[PDB]
Amino acid sequence: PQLHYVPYDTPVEDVMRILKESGTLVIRNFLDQNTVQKVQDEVDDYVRNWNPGPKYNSKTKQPSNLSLMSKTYRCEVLNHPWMHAICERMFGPTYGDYWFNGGSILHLEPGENTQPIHQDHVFYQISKWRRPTDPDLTINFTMALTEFTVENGGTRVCPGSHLWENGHASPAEEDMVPVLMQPGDALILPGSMWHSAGANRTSEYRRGFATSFHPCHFTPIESHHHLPREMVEEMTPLVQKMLGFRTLNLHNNVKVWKAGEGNLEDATGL
Amino acid sequence: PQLHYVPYDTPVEDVMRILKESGTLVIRNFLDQNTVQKVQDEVDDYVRNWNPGPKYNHDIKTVGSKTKQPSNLSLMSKTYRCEVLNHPWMHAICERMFGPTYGDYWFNGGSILHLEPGENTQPIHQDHVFYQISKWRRPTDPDLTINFTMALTEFTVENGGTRVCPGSHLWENGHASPAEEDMVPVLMQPGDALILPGSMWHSAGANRTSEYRRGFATSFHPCHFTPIESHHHLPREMVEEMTPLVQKMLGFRTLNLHNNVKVWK
Ligand SMILES: CC1(C)C(=O)C=C[C@@]2(C)[C@H]1CC[C@@]13C[C@@]4(C)C=C5C(=O)OC[C@]51[C@@](C)(C[C@@H]23)C4=O
Ligand SMILES: O=C(O)CNC(=O)C(=O)O
Ligand SMILES: [Fe+2]
Ligand SMILES: [Fe+2]
C-alpha cells in the first residue's frame, strides 16, 4: 500500500477502495482557499478580542468548540458532502447513523517535537474486541490551513498499518510517510491508521483543523448542549443531528438518544 | 446456575459473585413501600393515557399489542430522578461491572413495564441485542448494559412475571434462545428488583389474570455508549434539583474513561 493523492472529483467507490486498501488518502482541494481563510478568521476573532497594534495607544478568550467559535464550520464545513458520503459508506451498513465525535484547530508551534505515533481509536475500549477487517470506530478529516511539509512537522502516516492486529507494535519512525499538503487539502484518517505529527523545525506555525465522526451508539468527545439555541436553529437538520441535537437511528432501526419514546428534536421544538 | 432471592443487606461482592455464577438474581425489598407508592402516584395517568404497543417501528418485534412501555421516567416522576436514580445498589453494582474496563457509566434508559390483562408471552431475548458490538463481545467480557426491573405490582407466574434462564449469560453469541421450558419465573412482591445483565436471556410472561402486572426499570451502560434516552429536553429547574450523581447519570456532566480520557465534554 501507499499514500494516495486524489483530486476532488474522484469517484466515491474509488475513495472507499483506496481507504480499504491503504487505510488513508488525501483529497486535494477538499476546501477552497476562502473557506480556509474564513475558519481562521472566525477562530482568531473569538479567542482574541484584542490584537497588538503598531505602537502603544475580555482581552482574550479560552478556546471552545469549533462549531461555537466558527460559524462557517458549523454551517458550511460540517455540511461537507464528501465527509457525509464517506461516513455513510463506512458506518451505515454496520452501525447506521453517525455523528460528530470531536474537532479542533491544529497548531504546531515552532520547535515543537514529534508527536508519538498512535491510532485514533485507542481510547475506545471496544477496540480490543475489533478485528482489522471490521468497520472503523471513528474517522477524522484533517484539513490543512498552512501547507504541510516535512519541515514544519506535517502529518505522517504508515499505509497498511490499519490492517495490523490489536497487539501490533507501533510503526518505526523510518517507515512513516509524510503527508505533503497545500491549504484546502484534507487527509482522511480512519481510527485504525497509525499516524503522528512531525517535529516543526521551521520558524512558522503549522496550522490545520480537524473534523471527526463516529457511529451513533458511541459517546462523542464534545457535547454541544451549551451552545445558544439561536445558534442551534441556524444549523441544517443534518448538522443538528451531527452535534447531538436530534435522535439517531440504529441499523436495526432502534432509536438512540431519544426523547422518551419520541424524537429529541420534537420535544425541544427544533 | 440457579435463581437467587437475597435480602437487601446482602454483601455487594456476594451479589457480584451470584451475577457471575447465574447471570441474574433478585434483591428483595429493593424499594420500600413508600417509594413504590410515590412512583405509582406520579405515573398513574401517564401510563393510563399511553397507547399500547411500540411507539416507533424497529426490528426488535418484542412489544406486544397489550403491552405499555413508556419511558421518559425522569421527566414524568420526581421520585424517579430524585431517589430511584440515587439508589446505592444500582451504583455499587454498576461500579464493579463497568469501572474496571470502561471507567465511568451513566443512565442508558428506563421504561414502565405494564402488562395489560390478556397479553401473550414476550419473545425471549437478550437486552443487549440492539448493540451492534454485541456480536464482537465474548461471554467472558464485561456486560454492555445492566437493568434493574423493580416490581410495582406483584410478580407471579400467572400475571406475567418476568422469567429468566440462569446461566444463559455464559452462552456464545450464536447460541439459540432458550426454550420455554427452561425459563424460571421470577416471583416478586412490590419492592423487590430483578437484576438483568444485558447477556441474560429473559422475557415477560403472559398475563393470564384479571389484573395488570406493572413494573419499572432503570438501565445503565458504559460512559462511551450512547444512551437510548437523552435528557436535555427536560426543564432546567428540573436539572438543578438533581444530585451531582444524577446530573452525571443523565448526561449533564463530563464522563471519565478508564484511562482518564474525557468524553461528553
Ligand atoms: C425492544 C425491547 C423491548 C427489547 O425487546 C429489547 C431491548 C430493548 C431495545 C427493549 C426496549 C428498550 C430497552 C432500552 C433499555 C436501555 C431500557 C429499556 C427498559 O428499561 O426495558 C427495555 C429496555 C432495555 C432493558 C432493553 C431495551 C434497555 O436496556
Ligand atoms: O416486562 C418484563 O417483564 C420484561 N420486559 C423486557 O424485558 C423488555 O421489555 O425488554
Ligand atoms: Fe491523532
Ligand atoms: Fe428485556
Residue numbers in the entry:
A (entry chain A): 4 to 60, 68 to 280
B (entry chain B): 4 to 268
List sentences from the manuscript.
Here, we report the biochemical and structural characterizations of the unusually promiscuous and catalytically versatile Fe/αKG oxygenase SptF, involved in the biosynthesis of fungal meroterpenoid emervaridones. The in vitro analysis revealed that SptF catalyzes several continuous oxidation reactions, including hydroxylation, desaturation, epoxidation, and skeletal rearrangement. Fe/αKG oxygenases utilize αKG as a co-substrate and Fe(II) as a cofactor. Through the oxidative decarboxylation of αKG, a reactive Fe(IV)-oxo intermediate is generated to activate a selective aliphatic C–H bond, which is normally difficult to cleave due to high bond-dissociation energy, and then oxidative products are generated following radical recombination.
Asn65 in SptF is uniquely substituted with threonine in the closely related AndF. To clarify the function of Asn65, we constructed the SptF N65T variant, which converted 1 into 5 as the major product, with a slight amount of 4. Notably, in the crystal structure of SptF N65T-Fe/NOG/1, a hydrogen bond was observed between the C3 ketone at the A-ring and the newly introduced Thr65. These results indicated that a subtle change of the hydrogen-bond interactions affects the position of the hydrogen atom for abstraction and determines the product specificity. As a result, N65A significantly reduced the 4 and 5 formation activity to 20% and accumulated 3, suggesting that the hydrogen-bond interaction with Asn65 is not completely essential but moderately important for the binding of 3.
